[PDB]
Amino acid sequence: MRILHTSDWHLGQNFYSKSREAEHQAFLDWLLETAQTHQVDAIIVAGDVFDTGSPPSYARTLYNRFVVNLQQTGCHLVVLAGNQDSVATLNESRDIMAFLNTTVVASAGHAPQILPRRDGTPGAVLCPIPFLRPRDILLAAITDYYQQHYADACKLRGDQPLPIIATGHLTTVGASKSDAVRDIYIGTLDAFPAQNFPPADYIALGHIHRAQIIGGMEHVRYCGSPIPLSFDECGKSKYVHLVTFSNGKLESVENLNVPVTQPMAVLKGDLASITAQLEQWRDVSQEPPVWLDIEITTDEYLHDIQRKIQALTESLPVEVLLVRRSRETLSELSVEEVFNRRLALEELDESQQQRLQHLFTTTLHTLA
Amino acid sequence: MRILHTSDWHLGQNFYSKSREAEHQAFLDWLLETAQTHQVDAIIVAGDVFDTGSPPSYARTLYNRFVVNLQQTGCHLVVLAGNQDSVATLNESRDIMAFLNTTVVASAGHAPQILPRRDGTPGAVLCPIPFLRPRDIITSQAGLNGIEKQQHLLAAITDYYQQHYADACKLRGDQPLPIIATGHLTTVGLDAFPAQNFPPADYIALGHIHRAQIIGGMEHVRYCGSPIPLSFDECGKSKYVHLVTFSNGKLESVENLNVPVTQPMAVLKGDLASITAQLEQWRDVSQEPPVWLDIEITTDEYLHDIQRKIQALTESLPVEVLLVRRSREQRERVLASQQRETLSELSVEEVFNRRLALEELDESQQQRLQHLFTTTLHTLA
Amino acid sequence: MKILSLRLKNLNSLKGEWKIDFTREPFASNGLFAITGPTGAGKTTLLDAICLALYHETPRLSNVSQSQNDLMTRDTAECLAEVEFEVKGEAYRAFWSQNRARNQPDGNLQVPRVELARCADGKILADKVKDKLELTATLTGLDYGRFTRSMLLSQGQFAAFLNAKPKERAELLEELTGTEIYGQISAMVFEQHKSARTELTQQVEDWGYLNSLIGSKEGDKFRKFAQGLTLDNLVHLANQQLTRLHGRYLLQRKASEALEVEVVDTWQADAVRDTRTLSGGESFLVSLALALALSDLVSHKTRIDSLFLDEGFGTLDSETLDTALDALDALNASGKTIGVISHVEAMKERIPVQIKVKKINGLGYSKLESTFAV
Amino acid sequence: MKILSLRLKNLNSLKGEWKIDFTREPFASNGLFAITGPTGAGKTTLLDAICLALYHETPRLSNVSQSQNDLMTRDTAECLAEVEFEVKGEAYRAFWSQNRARNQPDGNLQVPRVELARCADGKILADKVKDKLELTATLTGLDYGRFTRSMLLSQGQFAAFLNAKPKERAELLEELTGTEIYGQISAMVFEQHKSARTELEQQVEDWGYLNSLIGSKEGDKFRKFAQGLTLDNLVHLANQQLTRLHGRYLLQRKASEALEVEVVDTWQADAVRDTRTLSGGESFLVSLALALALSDLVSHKTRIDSLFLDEGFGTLDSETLDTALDALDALNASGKTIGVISHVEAMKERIPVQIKVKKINGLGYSKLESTFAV
DNA sequence: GGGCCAGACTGGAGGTGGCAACGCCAATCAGCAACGACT
DNA sequence: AGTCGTTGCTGATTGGCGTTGCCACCTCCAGTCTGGCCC
Ligand SMILES: Nc1ncnc2c1ncn2[C@@H]1O[C@H](COP(=O)(O)OP(=O)(O)O)[C@@H](O)[C@H]1O
Ligand SMILES: Nc1ncnc2c1ncn2[C@@H]1O[C@H](COP(=O)(O)OP(=O)(O)O)[C@@H](O)[C@H]1O
Ligand SMILES: [Mg+2]
Ligand SMILES: [Mg+2]
Ligand SMILES: [Mn+2]
Ligand SMILES: [Mn+2]
């Protein structure tokens, strides 16, 4: 029995001006091909299927096309709602998805399901647990919910020799975050302790975009996004985990490298250094244009240095997406810094500054 | 074989900040019951399924619930794009609906297909044609006029219909199958599409008109209309869904099925006294849901804060007021009969009388208004 | 209201003290005089000095007071403007001056000192700012908002009356014709209606009906309604003036509540269209005709005989500028004296007398002809 | 953005169908071209067609639609304007047309027929007013409100940016720099403060404090505060451009909440002054330099390759005009095609490429050269 | 010579916007009364 | 020991800002006519 574990697809994410449609398509077809090759029994997607609560048209077409192509393969599939995914966007099509060997869970409290093998015999217990909204149920509340949900699954399994799998979309101690990772439970919880997970035979988690073994035990994993969703993780290869079970216990876990189709590179240093670093692509003729983040270390005006940057790039098969200085322009500074610069001109009493900062941050988060 | 002809659902439409979710759900359930009762083979939705390109979540939920609950009956379903809904939004679910006994068409060029009966035998040739957007069928070129471009568009759409019907006939061949046709465009039996340009299909189920009617006296070309009242201008009219039957490869008959009204609405005219008299008819009635009213107060220069009056009149009633308006439009300016009159010569009372003479009021209030006006001149002196 | 003498001291680019007298050997014919010179020389500064002396205000600067004085020349501690004008055959004098603290090129702006006096006997008639403004308004008949519409046409604001909103056109007309009572009537009606309403009666209903007809705060509604006759008289006078200034167009009021004027293109079979479609030059000529009609409207109550056109002669081509100047010459042959500022080379030859203003080799200052030096 | 061809039919004085195709033999050099002719000939109408076909508006008339259309010539039943422009090497076509009922001049006006389509592909991109406007705004980067301030400088509105309200200036700056999150933050802060205040009818005082700092409806306060950096970045480019146009002045940001630009007079020992005190020609040159900088602020995203301005040169003397024309010629080296409307004989003699809008006497109509007829 | 049928429209209402006239509150300005500031 | 120059302390005006209504553009229709032909 085999299961492919992936998460944080972030479908429909607009990377600056660019879009990730081609990357997502070339990932989904490869995933279907590898699923057929390894004759996997199920595919699990634990959170952040869509970049936002109102996905664009093409993202939904990609999702539906992938689900349709799944039928030709024969594997069962599970969808979970992440922190960015929204109920009434994944949960609205749930009833149609049932007819296509796919179960979609977005709201908590769903009873554990028996995941069938390719032959129709029971294979495991799923314990579908999506990103738990605090309003739907704190550290103990997550723990006892997990224990109670696992206990209910344990009662369902009885004495049958089947593995028990659990799901979750949450941050854990010892994890490494990124810029694209949106934080959760800003005012109530800081991190979940890895030792409070119920003794399930395997745990599938998302939220973190970097593959990590958490807590030191093998049966808990972060699978991470399948494509680079930020410029700080371009060089790291992305993984999808093919877990295996036998005689009701974990057998082995394997990492599969997702073939990169969209090159992305980050430049550094002064303009003189960048004029040499750009020669990596001189007359190379990369048929997919490379996406570049340029961390120029100068004090010159951004709206003036971008002109010469574009002039240098025009002779190369490259496309620059972002330029950042390592006087200031409004496109550079953070909203928090800009608001603080307003607070500085006002009286600098911390007793009110802390409350005003919290209020401004919660307002900005309500915009986002 | 039997099919239904409906269109203009306009799912997700917001009607004066109100939502039609319950009414649409009730209509869809009634349609499912009617299809089960009448043993129907297919259902055709001629465009305007969604009231916008990005329908809200509950509209998509209603569409999904309908298309999943239709699986019990086993009858086919055809959904076409209108001028309202989005081609990409409908093409989102094309392949997923292809597994659910449902076919959706949004773009042009989609080849004719054969509708199977409930037992799977070939029943009819569908020849699906959605709302033909100009960006799909014509290519713009420089040096044309506003009417010449429309003429080119009409020629192109007529040619498209003719060629697609020829292909449908080629597909049919010898088997006695009625070649149904579909479209979502305006016909007048100019920018409209003439009815005589339609191909000689056995039936043409059109869309884009919310009122059920026959075009050019040809019973095989019909507008099914909306199944629910989408505005106050059609509140009192009954809504129909056509039930079409075919025999031996030719059209047999068309039957009109009344869609029961779920949310009552009414419109009122006249002055405030007439509005009160017409509201008297709802004094003691258990109304579920409350009836929605449009009130058009005939103007006699009452000029009062009528919103408060309507709120007070309808407070104790089981009535919710969505809109009230009045026809108060009129110009207000002096006409200089001759250049010899200047503002210094004319007295204040003379100017005020000239002002009042432009209004069609009577002596029942003219005397009192003149007295009130003279009180102002009195208190400044 | 004719400008006899103009004295200014250290305003804008004109450093030092200067005086221009319009009764000397030049300007004796009362003809066209063209203030000429390079850009930024103080041409507009002369008209600004006139306006400042009359009304403590400038077309560019909203107010010059104890603060935000920026009309005074740099590195200079004092500025003043003085004019002499004649109304009803007797001459007056207006004075406005401001000096810096301790007479330094920096320091606090002291409160300005103003005065108004007769030249017949030297009696001081007013010295407070508010009293001087009120008395000069009563004497001349022109406030700032009427002086800048009839006598002085700033550069770019010639079409201000044409493009003004109805409220500020009706308010101008009522004050110009001395028919202000209708505004007070609307104010009283609105106040009575509001007072009746706040107590909460059929009397309130009658007050509301009356308010819907004529009542409005600040007297806008009934004023706009009543000034139709005034606008019709004004457009009649403007049409009569425009027949000789630009023969193509006529003028008439439109059937709308907003006080607006439409043109009747006599060339295109009297096709009537709105003034928004007029070309730049045609709108300049229409606005000039309307300003002259504004001057002619009150000629039976108070006569104004001076007109200053800052700019807008460039918008006209040569074949039209000559006709416009011929019409201006015909008007100037009467009692009205007019002065025009322009850079166009055609007007250099047509106007023989010029108040030339010259800059000095990039020093940042400018001087006019030494014959005007004090 | 650059204009490839212009086709108009029966607009204003230009009765008939006219097609002006650039990139031909006379316009192949991308050099200076000037539109010349008498006043009222229809010169501005050529620039009105370009704005009409693109943004369904013209500078003189707020909107043209079924309810009103004062742009189509009298005694004619239809009008249309169509332009070909090129953005990022790909050509597009915009089309706007309107016809009268029954083809009779007295008939009612029908709805306009608008399109937007690629020139080489031929595919139609938009067919409705709102769809076309939004798509062309996204494609070009600039809608009408930015076109009329950074790409076409209409007659008499060159100083619109300087004389605009701070609210409008900040809104334009956000439109160009795509920084609306600050306005959204301020608006929602104001909304939440209002909601808390009504729920009252210790959170309320903190919400009111935050509202007093950054809160305002439609985000005025925080927009104005945040756009200061963008204003400084614009002022840098404005100084760079103005150094060539007019060497006397430099620009410097006002130190006040209402974002404004002060001016530094290098000749007067670098004494700083408010921008209201500039002369007419100096203000025109400052506005031209500021608009060029405004079009250079977004050069990396969506470059603008053409500039049209309307008779702003009438306020310049023979020397300042020469300096400005030398600067414009030097800027023409970059490949920005400049079109000028004027009547000044010196610059009309200087510029060799001309589009002569000849006038027909009496009829009131006008025609171009025979080569532009179709 | 009159009635019926066939063309040809058409302005118009439910949604969206923008702006207009008020009511309000913070800002500004012109007179007074000292207060200092010189010879 | 006399005169003036400068600076706070009070009324008025007044102009932005928010508010509540009040007018301009799309997308589907019922009401309004007007001329020709046959009995
Ligand atoms: N406070 C000031 N001190 C010195 N010069 C000034 C001051 N204010 C304005 N100026 C300058 O005075 C000149 C006035 O020129 P102006 O009369 O406006 O010219 P034009 O008649 O060509 O329009 C300009 O150079 C202007 O910048
Ligand atoms: N609807 C119209 N019908 C006919 N002529 C018109 C119409 N609207 C404006 N015009 C005229 O068309 C001409 C346009 O000239 P314009 O381009 O404004 O000239 P300039 O370039 O000198 O400013 C003017 O004579 C104007 O009055
Ligand atoms: Mg000037
Ligand atoms: Mg012009
Ligand atoms: Mn996440
Ligand atoms: Mn994630």
Short mmCIF file of C-alpha atoms in Angstrom, two decimals, chain C residues 81-354:
data_model
loop_
_atom_site.label_atom_id
_atom_site.label_comp_id
_atom_site.label_asym_id
_atom_site.label_seq_id
_atom_site.Cartn_x
_atom_site.Cartn_y
_atom_site.Cartn_z
CA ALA C 81 1.34 100.05 -3.56
CA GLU C 82 -0.62 103.26 -4.12
CA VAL C 83 -3.14 104.18 -6.82
CA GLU C 84 -5.30 107.17 -7.71
CA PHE C 85 -8.71 106.56 -9.28
CA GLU C 86 -11.57 108.84 -10.29
CA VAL C 87 -15.24 108.07 -9.65
CA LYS C 88 -18.09 110.41 -10.63
CA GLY C 89 -15.67 113.16 -11.61
CA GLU C 90 -13.73 113.23 -8.33
CA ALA C 91 -10.46 111.45 -7.59
CA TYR C 92 -9.47 109.26 -4.64
CA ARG C 93 -6.29 107.56 -3.46
CA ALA C 94 -5.75 104.03 -2.13
CA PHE C 95 -2.70 102.93 -0.14
CA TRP C 96 -1.45 99.58 1.14
CA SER C 97 1.95 98.98 2.70
CA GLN C 98 3.79 96.40 4.77
CA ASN C 99 7.22 96.49 6.41
CA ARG C 100 9.38 93.95 8.19
CA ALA C 101 10.35 94.02 11.85
CA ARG C 102 13.36 96.28 12.53
CA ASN C 103 13.48 96.96 8.76
CA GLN C 104 15.49 93.78 8.20
CA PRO C 105 15.28 91.44 5.17
CA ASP C 106 13.98 88.93 7.70
CA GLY C 107 11.76 89.05 10.76
CA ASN C 108 8.07 89.19 11.56
CA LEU C 109 5.63 90.60 9.02
CA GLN C 110 4.07 93.60 10.72
CA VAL C 111 0.35 94.26 10.38
CA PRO C 112 -0.19 96.20 7.12
CA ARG C 113 -1.21 99.84 7.14
CA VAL C 114 -3.93 100.92 4.70
CA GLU C 115 -5.82 104.13 3.99
CA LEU C 116 -8.32 105.70 1.61
CA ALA C 117 -8.49 109.44 1.01
CA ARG C 118 -9.79 112.12 -1.33
CA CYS C 119 -7.43 114.09 -3.55
CA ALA C 120 -9.77 117.10 -3.42
CA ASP C 121 -8.97 117.91 0.22
CA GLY C 122 -6.73 115.11 1.55
CA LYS C 123 -9.27 113.95 4.14
CA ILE C 124 -8.69 110.39 5.35
CA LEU C 125 -11.91 108.44 4.87
CA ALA C 126 -10.92 105.00 6.22
CA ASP C 127 -7.82 103.39 7.72
CA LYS C 128 -9.00 100.01 9.03
CA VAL C 129 -8.78 97.11 6.57
CA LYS C 130 -12.44 96.09 6.85
CA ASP C 131 -13.72 99.67 6.81
CA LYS C 132 -11.55 100.53 3.81
CA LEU C 133 -12.80 97.49 1.91
CA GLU C 134 -16.44 98.26 2.71
CA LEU C 135 -16.10 101.95 1.82
CA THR C 136 -14.26 101.33 -1.44
CA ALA C 137 -16.82 98.68 -2.40
CA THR C 138 -19.67 101.11 -1.73
CA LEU C 139 -17.91 103.93 -3.58
CA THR C 140 -16.82 102.02 -6.69
CA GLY C 141 -19.67 99.51 -6.93
CA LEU C 142 -17.13 96.75 -7.62
CA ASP C 143 -15.93 94.18 -5.12
CA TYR C 144 -12.88 92.05 -5.94
CA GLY C 145 -15.08 89.40 -7.56
CA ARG C 146 -16.55 92.01 -9.91
CA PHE C 147 -13.37 94.00 -10.56
CA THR C 148 -11.62 90.80 -11.66
CA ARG C 149 -14.55 89.97 -13.98
CA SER C 150 -15.23 93.35 -15.60
CA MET C 151 -12.09 95.50 -15.48
CA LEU C 152 -9.13 93.11 -15.08
CA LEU C 153 -8.93 89.86 -17.06
CA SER C 154 -6.09 87.74 -15.70
CA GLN C 155 -4.16 85.33 -17.89
CA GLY C 156 -6.08 82.06 -18.13
CA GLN C 157 -9.10 83.43 -16.23
CA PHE C 158 -10.74 85.29 -19.12
CA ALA C 159 -13.27 82.45 -19.41
CA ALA C 160 -13.88 82.29 -15.65
CA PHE C 161 -17.34 83.83 -15.99
CA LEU C 162 -18.19 81.51 -18.89
CA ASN C 163 -17.01 78.43 -16.97
CA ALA C 164 -18.21 79.50 -13.51
CA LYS C 165 -20.78 77.45 -11.69
CA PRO C 166 -24.38 78.74 -11.59
CA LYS C 167 -24.24 79.65 -7.88
CA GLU C 168 -21.28 82.01 -8.29
CA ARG C 169 -22.72 83.49 -11.49
CA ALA C 170 -26.10 84.27 -9.94
CA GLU C 171 -24.39 85.71 -6.86
CA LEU C 172 -22.29 87.95 -9.10
CA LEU C 173 -25.35 89.10 -11.05
CA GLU C 174 -27.46 89.95 -8.00
CA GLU C 175 -24.67 92.07 -6.49
CA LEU C 176 -23.88 93.74 -9.82
CA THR C 177 -27.49 94.76 -10.47
CA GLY C 178 -28.37 95.58 -6.86
CA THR C 179 -31.20 93.04 -6.65
CA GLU C 180 -30.03 91.09 -3.60
CA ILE C 181 -33.42 90.83 -1.86
CA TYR C 182 -34.24 87.49 -3.50
CA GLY C 183 -31.35 85.77 -1.73
CA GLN C 184 -32.54 87.06 1.63
CA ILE C 185 -36.02 85.79 0.80
CA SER C 186 -34.72 82.25 0.23
CA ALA C 187 -32.59 82.42 3.37
CA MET C 188 -35.59 83.50 5.45
CA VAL C 189 -37.83 80.83 3.90
CA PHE C 190 -35.28 78.09 4.59
CA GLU C 191 -34.71 79.31 8.16
CA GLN C 192 -38.45 79.43 8.84
CA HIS C 193 -38.95 75.94 7.42
CA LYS C 194 -36.06 74.50 9.43
CA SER C 195 -37.29 76.15 12.63
CA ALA C 196 -40.80 74.80 12.06
CA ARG C 197 -39.44 71.31 11.36
CA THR C 198 -37.19 71.19 14.43
CA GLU C 199 -40.20 71.65 16.73
CA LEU C 200 -41.55 68.26 15.64
CA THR C 201 -48.99 70.57 11.53
CA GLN C 202 -50.35 71.82 8.21
CA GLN C 203 -48.34 75.04 8.56
CA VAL C 204 -45.15 72.97 8.46
CA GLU C 205 -46.48 71.32 5.30
CA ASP C 206 -47.07 74.73 3.69
CA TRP C 207 -43.60 75.87 4.73
CA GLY C 208 -42.12 72.74 3.18
CA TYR C 209 -44.00 73.28 -0.06
CA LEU C 210 -42.83 76.90 -0.19
CA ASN C 211 -39.25 75.83 0.54
CA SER C 212 -39.31 73.31 -2.31
CA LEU C 213 -40.28 76.13 -4.67
CA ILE C 214 -37.91 78.98 -3.79
CA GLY C 215 -36.37 78.12 -0.44
CA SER C 216 -32.72 77.15 -0.05
CA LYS C 217 -29.85 78.04 2.24
CA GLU C 218 -27.60 80.93 1.17
CA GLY C 219 -30.36 82.00 -1.23
CA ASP C 220 -29.19 79.99 -4.25
CA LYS C 221 -32.47 78.75 -5.70
CA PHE C 222 -34.69 81.82 -5.97
CA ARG C 223 -31.65 83.92 -6.89
CA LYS C 224 -30.92 81.61 -9.83
CA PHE C 225 -34.60 81.69 -10.79
CA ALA C 226 -34.89 85.49 -10.61
CA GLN C 227 -31.62 86.41 -12.33
CA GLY C 228 -32.93 85.06 -15.64
CA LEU C 229 -33.97 88.56 -16.68
CA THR C 230 -30.54 89.92 -15.74
CA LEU C 231 -28.82 87.16 -17.71
CA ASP C 232 -31.06 87.90 -20.70
CA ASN C 233 -30.22 91.61 -20.60
CA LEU C 234 -26.53 90.78 -20.23
CA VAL C 235 -26.57 88.34 -23.15
CA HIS C 236 -28.40 90.92 -25.27
CA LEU C 237 -25.67 93.48 -24.55
CA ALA C 238 -22.97 90.85 -25.11
CA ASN C 239 -24.46 89.87 -28.47
CA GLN C 240 -24.61 93.52 -29.53
CA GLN C 241 -20.96 93.92 -28.53
CA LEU C 242 -19.94 90.66 -30.21
CA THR C 243 -21.51 91.47 -33.60
CA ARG C 244 -18.48 93.68 -34.29
CA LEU C 245 -15.87 91.66 -32.38
CA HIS C 246 -16.55 88.27 -34.01
CA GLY C 247 -19.23 88.24 -36.68
CA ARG C 248 -19.77 84.48 -36.86
CA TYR C 249 -21.47 83.87 -33.52
CA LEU C 250 -24.44 85.16 -31.57
CA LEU C 251 -25.41 84.54 -27.96
CA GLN C 252 -28.61 83.52 -26.19
CA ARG C 253 -29.64 81.95 -22.91
CA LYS C 254 -30.73 78.32 -22.84
CA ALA C 255 -33.91 76.83 -21.39
CA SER C 256 -32.31 75.38 -18.27
CA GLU C 257 -32.36 76.06 -14.54
CA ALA C 258 -28.60 76.66 -14.57
CA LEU C 259 -27.68 80.15 -15.78
CA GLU C 260 -26.02 79.19 -19.06
CA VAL C 261 -25.48 80.76 -22.48
CA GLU C 262 -25.51 79.06 -25.89
CA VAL C 263 -24.11 80.25 -29.21
CA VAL C 264 -26.03 80.44 -32.49
CA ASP C 265 -23.63 79.73 -35.37
CA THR C 266 -25.05 82.03 -38.04
CA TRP C 267 -22.85 80.40 -40.70
CA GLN C 268 -24.35 76.92 -40.21
CA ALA C 269 -27.98 77.97 -40.74
CA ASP C 270 -28.36 79.23 -37.15
CA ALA C 271 -27.48 75.87 -35.59
CA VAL C 272 -27.47 76.38 -31.82
CA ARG C 273 -24.90 74.60 -29.64
CA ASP C 274 -23.38 74.94 -26.18
CA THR C 275 -20.35 77.12 -25.46
CA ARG C 276 -18.34 74.07 -24.36
CA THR C 277 -17.76 73.35 -28.06
CA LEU C 278 -16.20 76.76 -28.77
CA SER C 279 -12.57 76.92 -29.82
CA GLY C 280 -10.01 78.63 -27.61
CA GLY C 281 -10.01 81.86 -29.59
CA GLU C 282 -13.78 81.91 -30.00
CA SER C 283 -14.25 81.39 -26.25
CA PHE C 284 -11.74 84.17 -25.56
CA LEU C 285 -13.70 86.54 -27.80
CA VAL C 286 -17.02 85.47 -26.25
CA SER C 287 -15.63 86.05 -22.75
CA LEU C 288 -14.25 89.46 -23.75
CA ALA C 289 -17.66 90.41 -25.14
CA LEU C 290 -19.34 89.19 -21.95
CA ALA C 291 -16.93 91.26 -19.85
CA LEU C 292 -17.68 94.34 -21.94
CA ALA C 293 -21.40 93.64 -21.49
CA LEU C 294 -20.81 93.36 -17.74
CA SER C 295 -19.25 96.83 -17.89
CA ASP C 296 -22.13 98.20 -19.99
CA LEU C 297 -24.83 96.68 -17.77
CA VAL C 298 -24.29 99.08 -14.85
CA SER C 299 -23.38 102.14 -16.94
CA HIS C 300 -26.57 103.84 -15.71
CA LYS C 301 -25.65 103.40 -12.02
CA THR C 302 -21.84 103.50 -11.91
CA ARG C 303 -19.61 103.89 -14.96
CA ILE C 304 -16.31 102.03 -15.35
CA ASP C 305 -14.03 103.27 -18.12
CA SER C 306 -10.89 101.09 -17.81
CA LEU C 307 -10.17 97.57 -19.06
CA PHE C 308 -7.00 95.49 -18.69
CA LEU C 309 -6.45 92.27 -20.65
CA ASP C 310 -3.49 90.28 -19.24
CA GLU C 311 -3.24 87.53 -21.94
CA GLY C 312 -5.13 85.24 -24.37
CA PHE C 313 -4.36 87.28 -27.53
CA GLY C 314 -2.03 84.44 -28.61
CA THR C 315 -4.97 82.00 -28.97
CA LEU C 316 -5.96 84.15 -31.98
CA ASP C 317 -4.51 83.95 -35.47
CA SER C 318 -3.28 86.98 -37.41
CA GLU C 319 -6.36 87.23 -39.63
CA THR C 320 -8.60 87.37 -36.53
CA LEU C 321 -6.32 89.32 -34.19
CA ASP C 322 -6.39 92.33 -36.52
CA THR C 323 -10.20 92.38 -36.50
CA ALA C 324 -10.25 92.02 -32.71
CA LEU C 325 -7.80 94.91 -32.37
CA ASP C 326 -9.89 97.01 -34.76
CA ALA C 327 -12.96 96.41 -32.59
CA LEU C 328 -10.90 97.28 -29.51
CA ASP C 329 -9.77 100.50 -31.22
CA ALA C 330 -13.39 101.35 -32.02
CA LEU C 331 -14.31 100.82 -28.37
CA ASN C 332 -11.29 102.84 -27.20
CA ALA C 333 -12.37 105.75 -29.42
CA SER C 334 -15.13 106.12 -26.81
CA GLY C 335 -14.47 107.05 -23.19
CA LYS C 336 -13.11 103.61 -22.32
CA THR C 337 -9.32 103.23 -22.11
CA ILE C 338 -7.87 99.74 -22.48
CA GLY C 339 -4.42 98.23 -21.95
CA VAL C 340 -3.26 94.90 -23.39
CA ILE C 341 -0.33 92.65 -22.47
CA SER C 342 0.99 90.28 -25.12
CA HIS C 343 4.16 88.84 -26.64
CA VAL C 344 2.85 88.39 -30.20
CA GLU C 345 4.91 90.27 -32.78
CA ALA C 346 1.86 91.61 -34.64
CA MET C 347 0.73 93.72 -31.68
CA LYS C 348 4.23 95.22 -31.40
CA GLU C 349 3.60 97.48 -34.41
CA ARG C 350 -0.11 98.21 -33.95
CA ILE C 351 0.23 99.70 -30.44
CA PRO C 352 2.70 102.62 -30.56
CA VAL C 353 3.01 103.40 -26.84
CA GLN C 354 4.47 100.68 -24.61
#
